[PDB]
Amino acid sequence: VFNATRFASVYAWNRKRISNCVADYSVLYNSASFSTFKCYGVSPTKLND
Amino acid sequence: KNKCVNFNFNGLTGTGVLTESNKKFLPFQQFGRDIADTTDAVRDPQTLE
Amino acid sequence: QCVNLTTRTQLPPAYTNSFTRGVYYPDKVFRSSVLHSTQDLFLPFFSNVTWFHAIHKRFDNPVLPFNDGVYFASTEKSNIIRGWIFGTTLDSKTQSLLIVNNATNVVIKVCEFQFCNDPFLGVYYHKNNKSWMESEFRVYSSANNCTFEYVSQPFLMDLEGKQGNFKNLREFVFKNIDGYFKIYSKHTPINLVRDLPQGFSALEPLVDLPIGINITRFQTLLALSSSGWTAGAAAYYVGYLQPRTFLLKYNENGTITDAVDCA
Amino acid sequence: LCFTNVYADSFVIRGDEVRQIAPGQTGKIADYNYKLPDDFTGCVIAWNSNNLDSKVGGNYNYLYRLFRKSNLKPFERDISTEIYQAGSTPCNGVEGF
Ligand SMILES: *[C@@H]1O[C@H](CO)[C@@H](O[C@@H]2O[C@H](CO)[C@@H](O[C@H]3O[C@H](CO)[C@@H](O)[C@H](O)[C@@H]3O)[C@H](O)[C@H]2NC(C)=O)[C@H](O)[C@H]1NC(C)=O
Ligand SMILES: *[C@@H]1O[C@H](CO)[C@@H](O[C@@H]2O[C@H](CO)[C@@H](O)[C@H](O)[C@H]2NC(C)=O)[C@H](O)[C@H]1NC(C)=O
Ligand SMILES: *[C@@H]1O[C@H](CO)[C@@H](O[C@@H]2O[C@H](CO)[C@@H](O)[C@H](O)[C@H]2NC(C)=O)[C@H](O)[C@H]1NC(C)=O
Ligand SMILES: *[C@@H]1O[C@H](CO)[C@@H](O[C@@H]2O[C@H](CO)[C@@H](O)[C@H](O)[C@H]2NC(C)=O)[C@H](O)[C@H]1NC(C)=O
Ligand SMILES: *[C@@H]1O[C@H](CO)[C@@H](O)[C@H](O)[C@H]1NC(C)=O
């Protein structure tokens, strides 16, 4: 998701199904460096629980 | 004292008549609060009365 | 220094009753002639305050849990209880808080201490001088990474006395909430022999330390060739605070004069 | 307005991570080295310091914690440098797989 060599154009934006996986978002701390990360249906603290 | 004034003690803005009290605040206390929880007494911060 | 003083008799764990103690002023607001309900980490009424002795024979300084705050009290004579150690490893893998009252001044310091298995202070008793003076300080070996440090203005507090019944009760509440370590304390004279006096008196706040360390265990520091000594006639009691509603009576002068434990 | 007890917490972070300084946030700054309480009463102040702190060869005097067994508590400061175990094995000494 966050490392794909080539992203899609915004008019042709891609959609990928994520299923049967563990959402351990900690793994990308070392290398993500997100300028924006905003949640709208949850508090960000709760994502692990 | 004894006149109606718009007071401000440590930012504690309000309107009321100031009067000399006989309440004995232990030093760690600056404000006293009513049954209604409205601040009813204050320790003047320049002349500690 | 750092020495193990292993000469001591083995006794089982004692307990006693916290009748109506461990109540403190819940905030710095004044209130008089009112009954005030508040929910906070209080010492539950009539709970078991674990009980420890220093005798002659017995010198009890265990490392104890520190969870949801602690109530600490010491029926003290001849100034035997002198401080505490707080932390979660007490081995310099992590930081720890040291509070010590020594003969010259009170010192509060937070460092990566390397504490001894048996920390203590010591006094030379009647060594041809008529007065008593402190000589031994054996709690930690080195204190490198310090991030908080306070030392009070100097004094001389006497370390001599042999009267039978305890003449001082010192009470403390310790809470470590969101990086602020809060201490409430009270002092009352007593004339009791061997138990936590029955009665009621609320602790005023005195100091709030922004140490910001993780505290899971704590240990009190008592005054005391390397092995074989005599312990002072002093006893201290430890309870634990739980989140409980307390109704508090304020008298006409604003001091909490009575309280009721809602549970 | 007057203030009763005032503490200034001073530190340097990557510009992307200023958003993590708000109370109730996640990320390796909020999670592992600096957490603000949910009822935080105060103000957050930050300014771009590239002209002061940056070094042509790279200024490495500014450190952040990348691994932690658990998210730290508000206003908690973890100085520990002990090695973090990612796998199920224990790891002693200085380094390992
Ligand atoms: C504040 O310090 C606490 C004490 O060190 C610490 O709790 C400790 O957490 C670790 C890891 O969760 C525990 O280590 C053991 O955990 C279980 C048993 O509880 C075992 O399966 C593991 O293999 C490991 O041996 C400690 O037992 C635990 N200590 C206590 C007294 O509960 C807190 O996590 C610290 N707080 C923060 C925010 O870091
Ligand atoms: C605040 O300032 C006042 C002076 O501006 C201090 O009060 C003075 O105290 C002396 C000694 O009692 C009096 O002679 C002066 O008349 C007082 N000043 C006024 C304006 O009445 C006061 O001490 C200061 N606050 C504190 C906490 O020291
Ligand atoms: C006091 O006794 C404790 C044990 O009760 C000693 O701690 C041991 O120290 C050795 C290294 O010197 C370690 O290998 C052991 O694992 C430790 N045991 C425990 C239970 O911690 C301590 O060294 C002694 N101190 C003195 C000054 O004799
Ligand atoms: C915690 O203590 C260690 C050990 O002294 C400190 O590591 C030293 O840091 C200084 C300053 O950069 C170096 O000159 C030394 O070479 C380091 N010693 C070792 C053995 O690595 C560390 O900096 C301390 N941490 C804090 C936050 O004070
Ligand atoms: C007696 O006091 C003096 C200083 O007043 C001190 O130097 C000396 O060591 C003391 N003697 C003993 C036995 O402690």
Swiss-Prot record, chain B:
It comes from the Viruses. Changing residue 13 to K: In strain: Omicron/BA.1. Attaches the virion to the cell membrane by interacting with host receptor, initiating the infection. The major receptor is host ACE2. When S2/S2' has been cleaved, binding to the receptor triggers direct fusion at the cell membrane. When S2/S2' has not been cleaved, binding to the receptor results in internalization of the virus by endocytosis using host TFRC and GRM2 and leading to fusion of the virion membrane with the host endosomal membrane. Alternatively, may use NRP1/NRP2 and integrin as entry receptors. Binds to host ACE2. RBD also interacts with the N-linked glycan on 'Asn-90' of ACE2. Cleavage of S generates a polybasic C-terminal sequence on S1 that binds to host Neuropilin-1 (NRP1) and Neuropilin-2 (NRP2) receptors. Interacts with host integrin alpha-5/beta-1 (ITGA5:ITGB1) and with ACE2 in complex with integrin alpha-5/beta-1 (ITGA5:ITGB1). May interact via cytoplasmic c-terminus with M protein. May interact (via N-terminus) with host bilirubin and biliverdin, thereby preventing antibody binding to the SARS-CoV-2 spike NTD via an allosteric mechanism. This is Spike protein S1. The chain holds residues 535 to 583 of 1273 of the full protein.
UniProtKB/Swiss-Prot annotation, chain C:
Residues 122-144, 153-165 are annotated as: Disordered. Changing residue 193 to G: In strain: Omicron/BA.2, Omicron/BA.2.12.1, Omicron/BA.2.75, Omicron/BA.4, Omicron/BA.5, Omicron/BQ.1.1. Glycans are attached at residues 4, 48, 102, 129, 145, 214, 253. Changing residue 134 to K: In strain: Kappa/B.1.617.1. Changing residue 122 to D: In strain: Kappa/B.1.617.1, Omicron/BA.2, Omicron/BA.2.12.1, Omicron/BA.2.75, Omicron/BA.4, Omicron/BA.5, Omicron/BQ.1.1, Omicron/XBB.1.5, Omicron/EG.5.1. Changing residue 13 to S: In strain: Gamma/P.1. It comes from the Viruses. Changing residue 195 to G: In strain: Beta/B.1.351. Changing residue 170 to K: Partial loss of biliverdin affinity. Changing residue 170 to S: In strain: Gamma/P.1. Attaches the virion to the cell membrane by interacting with host receptor, initiating the infection. The major receptor is host ACE2. When S2/S2' has been cleaved, binding to the receptor triggers direct fusion at the cell membrane. When S2/S2' has not been cleaved, binding to the receptor results in internalization of the virus by endocytosis using host TFRC and GRM2 and leading to fusion of the virion membrane with the host endosomal membrane. Alternatively, may use NRP1/NRP2 and integrin as entry receptors. Binds to host ACE2. RBD also interacts with the N-linked glycan on 'Asn-90' of ACE2. Cleavage of S generates a polybasic C-terminal sequence on S1 that binds to host Neuropilin-1 (NRP1) and Neuropilin-2 (NRP2) receptors. Interacts with host integrin alpha-5/beta-1 (ITGA5:ITGB1) and with ACE2 in complex with integrin alpha-5/beta-1 (ITGA5:ITGB1). May interact via cytoplasmic c-terminus with M protein. May interact (via N-terminus) with host bilirubin and biliverdin, thereby preventing antibody binding to the SARS-CoV-2 spike NTD via an allosteric mechanism. This is Spike protein S1. It comes from Severe acute respiratory syndrome coronavirus 2. The gene is S. The chain holds residues 14 to 292 of 1273 of the full protein.
